[PDB]
Amino acid sequence: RIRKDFGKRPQVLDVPYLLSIQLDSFQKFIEQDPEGQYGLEAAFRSVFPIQSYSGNSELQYVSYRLGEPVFDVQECQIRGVTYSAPLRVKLRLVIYEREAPEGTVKDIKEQEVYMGEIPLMTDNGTFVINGTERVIVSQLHRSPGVFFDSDKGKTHSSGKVLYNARIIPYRGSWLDFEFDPKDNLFVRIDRRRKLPATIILRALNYTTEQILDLFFEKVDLLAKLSQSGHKRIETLFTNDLDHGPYISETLRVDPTNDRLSALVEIYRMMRPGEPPTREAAESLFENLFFSEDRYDLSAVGRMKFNRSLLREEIEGSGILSKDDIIDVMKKLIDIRNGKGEVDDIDHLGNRRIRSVGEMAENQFRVGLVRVERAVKERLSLGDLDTLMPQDMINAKPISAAVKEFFGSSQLSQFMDQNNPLSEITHKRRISALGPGGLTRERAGFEVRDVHPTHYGRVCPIETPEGPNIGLINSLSVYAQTNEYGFLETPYRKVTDGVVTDEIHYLSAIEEGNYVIAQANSNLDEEGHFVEDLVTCRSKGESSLFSRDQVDYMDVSTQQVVSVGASLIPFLEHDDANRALMGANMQRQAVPTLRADKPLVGTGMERAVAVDSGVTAVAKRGGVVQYVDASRIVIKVNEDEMYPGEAGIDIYNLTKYTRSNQNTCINQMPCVSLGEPVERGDVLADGPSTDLGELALGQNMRVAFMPWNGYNFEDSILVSERVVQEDRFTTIHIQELACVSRDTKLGPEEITADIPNVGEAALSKLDESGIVYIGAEVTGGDILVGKVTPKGETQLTPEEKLLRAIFGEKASDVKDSSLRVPNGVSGTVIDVQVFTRDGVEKD
Amino acid sequence: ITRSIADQARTIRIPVHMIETINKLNRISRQMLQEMGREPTPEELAERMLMPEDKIRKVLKIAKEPISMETPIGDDEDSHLGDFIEDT
Amino acid sequence: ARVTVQDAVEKIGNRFDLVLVAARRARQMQVGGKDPLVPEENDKTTVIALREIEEGLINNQILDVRERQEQQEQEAAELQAVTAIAEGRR
Amino acid sequence: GVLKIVKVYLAVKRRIQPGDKMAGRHGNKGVISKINPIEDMPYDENGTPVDIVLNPLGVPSRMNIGQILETHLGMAAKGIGMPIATPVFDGAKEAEIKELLKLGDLPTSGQIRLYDGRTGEQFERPVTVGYMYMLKLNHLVDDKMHARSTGSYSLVTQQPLGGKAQFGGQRFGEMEVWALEAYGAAYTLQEMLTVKSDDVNGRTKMYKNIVDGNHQMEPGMPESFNVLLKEIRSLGINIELEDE
């Protein structure tokens, strides 16, 4: 069968791993065997050394440990237990009687203690809490940094680029150095603590011959700085000094109870007052602390600092000398003269996401430091040398804020198992919901839409239709995120005419700083360009002319479409409206028996069923022993040929089983026995897919022509021949269960031999309590025989009257079995009986 | 202050030892957990206490709040906890 | 549409009137049995079912109307007095 | 207070039934209502009943014309016995497909002569016939047929509820009250407030009126009204009813 192809447009690179984001990121937190002390170790550096100083007690952290789990693996799926592995840390506590772990005498120390227990990752990369697997989706927010906004009104003031300076560390302080004329200088601290700024500079060692004598010459808007100093008409210098000139004593005048004096006044604002014995009662907050640094050693707050400001002084500020107040005020004037530092609000280069790897950090810290409020309570009751072992730290507190995140958060949802293809697309999205500060419900007409910078980043097509438009989206095919946050997209580089075939992954940060051309641009041999009017763009602004300005071009044209909207035949003929209404409904598909690959395709349906991990993939060569339609076993050649000595690796073929949304997830063996298979070979095809590509629906014929009215509005008639072949059969499957109780009357039991007055309950139940598999009746019958005595096995006289008319036969026990609920019945799949097993059941 | 709240604490009257029997089995649960490391099964504590094992389970059912009535459920508009119980 | 329905609104110069004409009297015919209805069995609806006719309906009694008659409180005062009506079994 | 647990599944083979929704990849949302018999089903020359008859009523508002290159091309690809590789924003062409349509069976434009199975006369202006990739979306249970007539009631509230075995009653929202007042009705307005909800002693008596073939009398006093008299009574204010 000859294969005639048309277009090709060869690509220098293929589609990266779609499930690469949620794999490497989570492996940078646990840190068990590979790395030593980095990820997880950073979590113990925040809580420890936990110091509850109450005399002579200190707890120091050493190292961690990951041993064996709680119990078996195949046992927490039938009880609802999150499979995890406890941790072991070293503690070193000291008693007032000088008892620190360092010797062998009078020095006790424990090394192995298991309390906390965090979940793990397996194969694909999905957690599992309370039986139901949980998946965490990364959200999008504005990266913390120094930006420049605007301010209404004013129309007669100063400030930075425009007006009010607005910075966002993370919690530290909102430094506001605005300028309001008239009299009092407008300056905030943390909220709105209003106070004259004329005494602030005085504290930082600045006389009246610095800020108002060498700055008022270039601007006469210092009516707020020439108030306290009071520099009216030229008069006698000495003997006429005020707050400004002098520093220590300072002028002692003010219409109020207290009195101002620069230095010894910054605290007088808070009534009543107290002696200057506290030189650092608040100044110790703007220095050595998590106030300034927005991340570990300014690993995030670096690009958004030295790039706009000047340089950098230590992680914080320092003692008396503060270079965090002078390096910021120099900007409010710099731009006031002529610079150009405007930051775009709706800019991708200013917003990054937080993968599961990062979310696993901040959520593990808040859960660990939670026990701190419990290790101090058990201390007040402590005796002497008995409060050393695990009599302080508790497992419950630390194992609480960790289980309430992977099952109870705005980023934790159930995976859509309606379609194997819809599975990967569910994680291939980024919700705009999250923090209340980084995300608001305000009217953002210029945000809830698509920006030109999303070209190659986020597919402007695949977006949930409805009120939540623009918020939720999806990742492109050639769109991958690094270890930072921003999305990185391949872009070939050029240098004046010549073009290099080699691509270059670049973030969205420099995307607006540099110019990017078009892929469909003419090009004749690497060296010369064939156009003088290159149609390129420059950060939400399509430019024109000039060929030397560009430095990057689009290598692929598929970078615009997502991973699910690229399977549809002919996209150029489809409108952006229906191109979405055909994708949001595609993820709501359902595996059908009669499933076949569409006659036409694009060649991307195969790469989907592979990365998704639907079909079985062998990891070692060898022949096939059995090929049952429910179990397949492959024997390898690593051990001597022995009936009971070999690499037995049974492949559990999941038959008709449940699902998150009552769907059908089965596999059909496509490989015969005898024929040797190797790595990459498919063992069994997935549910809704043939050979391993698409195959969601099917193809039928059609006599396109109206039918006398019957097809009014979206009304469609279907031939009966289609029903005859039952090509549209979907298995729903439900879930029933019978629970025995210890009633006061008397605990009941399940058995086939029931003292009932009927036989209908005996026809089914015959296998000693349980019933055989597969059959047929109707709703309102008996599934599990139940014998629960009522009325304390004592009949009433007046009752015997009623049954005396319709055959006197009142037995002590009756048949109170669970009847079938209203609706439609169905066959049974499996039957499980746990009559008090010797295992660890609760 | 330890006499008034010793009985008339909850909205409904509550015995004295009924609240003193809870913390009694508490200062021993962690006692065997800090040593062995396993949960104290209702077999070893049945020989140290005056309670068998069956009736002791029904005792916990009594120790509750229990629950109000005017609490939103799903509709959060007109639906109340005490508005779904049928009358006999 | 329906039988003799637009003819009742054209014969008299009002629509809201025809309402009570076949309302407070119709519902009263059932709570009073069927004997109060003295007119012949001619003015009665027709229901096709099992080759026979049942029910009764109304809208075929409006013929001899008048202005002032009885108040409005006695309509169901002496009505339920002369006839009690109920339901018994053997 | 539990001995052991017994789990029993309930697999159901849901077959095709008029009420679901069907949509392929282009967005041709539809719904089956009536199954067209084979007897009155027209066919082609060789005699081939239509698998499913669509609806040529609605196109200009969708603006998604592109599945044409899948129907015509799909028909010719069958006669020649080859897969078509068409990338994104590119692939086949109008002139390329037209050349391929030359082969196939006999037609080349797509419009084949359709013979009517009813009257027998051939339909004027032949219609197009080909293969379309559709899909049967899952039938949500949120649109299941529900209907309630009798159920349980509260104590202080005294209103229609909805348990498990029993269905739920449609709450007559206020939005439908004013629309009724516009007509200038009467009795049909007081009923959707008393017996049919609040009134209790007027609900039971009515049930014993339509059983013997009689008529229900006038409702009494609402329960949410006779209790308010006491609710306001505990507010230092006395309320008392009065007739004429």
UniProtKB/Swiss-Prot annotation, chain A:
<keyword id="KW-0804">Transcription</keyword>
<comment type="subunit">
    <text>(Microbial infection) Interacts (via flap domain) with Escherichia phage lambda antitermination protein Q; this interaction renders bacterial RNAP resistant to transcription pausing and allows it to read through termination signals.</text>
</comment>
<keyword id="KW-0548">Nucleotidyltransferase</keyword>
<dbReference type="GO" id="GO:0071973">
    <property type="term" value="P:bacterial-type flagellum-dependent cell motility"/>
</dbReference>
<keyword id="KW-0240">DNA-directed RNA polymerase</keyword>
<dbReference type="GO" id="GO:2000142">
    <property type="term" value="P:regulation of DNA-templated transcription initiation"/>
</dbReference>
<dbReference type="GO" id="GO:0048870">
    <property type="term" value="P:cell motility"/>
</dbReference>
<dbReference type="GO" id="GO:0090605">
    <property type="term" value="P:submerged biofilm formation"/>
</dbReference>
<comment type="subunit">
    <text>The RNAP catalytic core consists of 2 alpha, 1 beta, 1 beta' and 1 omega subunit. When a sigma factor is associated with the core the holoenzyme is formed, which can initiate transcription. The rRNA transcription and antitermination complex (rrnTAC) consists of RNAP, NusA, NusB, NusE (rpsJ), NusG, SubB, ribosomal protein S4, DNA and precursor rRNA; S4 is more flexible than other subunits. In pull-down experiments interacts with CedA.</text>
</comment>
<comment type="similarity">
    <text>Belongs to the RNA polymerase beta chain family.</text>
</comment>
<comment type="function">
    <text>DNA-dependent RNA polymerase (RNAP) catalyzes the transcription of DNA into RNA using the four ribonucleoside triphosphates as substrates.</text>
</comment>
<dbReference type="GO" id="GO:0046677">
    <property type="term" value="P:response to antibiotic"/>
</dbReference>
<dbReference type="GO" id="GO:0005829">
    <property type="term" value="C:cytosol"/>
</dbReference>
<dbReference type="GO" id="GO:0044780">
    <property type="term" value="P:bacterial-type flagellum assembly"/>
</dbReference>
<dbReference type="GO" id="GO:0016020">
    <property type="term" value="C:membrane"/>
</dbReference>
UniProtKB/Swiss-Prot annotation, chain B:
<comment type="subunit">
    <text>Interacts transiently with the RNA polymerase catalytic core formed by RpoA, RpoB, RpoC and RpoZ (2 alpha, 1 beta, 1 beta' and 1 omega subunit) to form the RNA polymerase holoenzyme that can initiate transcription. Identified in a complex containing RpoD, the RNA polymerase subunits RpoA, RpoB and RpoZ, CRP and DNA. Interacts with Rsd; this prevents interaction with the RNA polymerase catalytic core and with promoter DNA, and as a consequence, promotes transcription from promoters that require alternative sigma factors.</text>
</comment>
<comment type="subunit">
    <text>(Microbial infection) Interacts with Escherichia phage lambda antitermination protein Q.</text>
</comment>
<protein>
    <recommendedName>
        <fullName>RNA polymerase sigma factor RpoD</fullName>
    </recommendedName>
</protein>
<comment type="function">
    <text>Sigma factors are initiation factors that promote the attachment of RNA polymerase to specific initiation sites and are then released. This sigma factor is the primary sigma factor during exponential growth. Preferentially transcribes genes associated with fast growth, such as ribosomal operons, other protein-synthesis related genes, rRNA- and tRNA-encoding genes and prfB.</text>
</comment>
<feature type="region of interest" description="Sigma-70 factor domain-3">
    <location>
        <begin position="20"/>
        <end position="88"/>
    </location>
</feature>
<comment type="similarity">
    <text>Belongs to the sigma-70 factor family. RpoD/SigA subfamily.</text>
</comment>
From Swiss-Prot, chain C:
<keyword id="KW-0808">Transferase</keyword>
<dbReference type="GO" id="GO:0044780">
    <property type="term" value="P:bacterial-type flagellum assembly"/>
</dbReference>
<protein>
    <recommendedName>
        <fullName>DNA-directed RNA polymerase subunit omega</fullName>
        <ecNumber>2.7.7.6</ecNumber>
    </recommendedName>
</protein>
<comment type="function">
    <text>Part of the processive rRNA transcription and antitermination complex (rrnTAC). The complex forms an RNA-chaperone ring around the RNA exit tunnel of RNAP. It supports rapid transcription and antitermination of rRNA operons, cotranscriptional rRNA folding, and annealing of distal rRNA regions to allow correct ribosome biogenesis.</text>
</comment>
<dbReference type="GO" id="GO:0003899">
    <property type="term" value="F:DNA-directed RNA polymerase activity"/>
</dbReference>
<dbReference type="GO" id="GO:0005829">
    <property type="term" value="C:cytosol"/>
</dbReference>
<dbReference type="GO" id="GO:2000142">
    <property type="term" value="P:regulation of DNA-templated transcription initiation"/>
</dbReference>
<dbReference type="GO" id="GO:0006879">
    <property type="term" value="P:intracellular iron ion homeostasis"/>
</dbReference>
<dbReference type="GO" id="GO:0030880">
    <property type="term" value="C:RNA polymerase complex"/>
</dbReference>
<keyword id="KW-0240">DNA-directed RNA polymerase</keyword>
<dbReference type="GO" id="GO:0001000">
    <property type="term" value="F:bacterial-type RNA polymerase core enzyme binding"/>
</dbReference>
<dbReference type="InterPro" id="IPR036161">
    <property type="entry name" value="RPB6/omega-like_sf"/>
</dbReference>
<keyword id="KW-0804">Transcription</keyword>
<dbReference type="GO" id="GO:0071973">
    <property type="term" value="P:bacterial-type flagellum-dependent cell motility"/>
</dbReference>
<dbReference type="GO" id="GO:0032784">
    <property type="term" value="P:regulation of DNA-templated transcription elongation"/>
</dbReference>
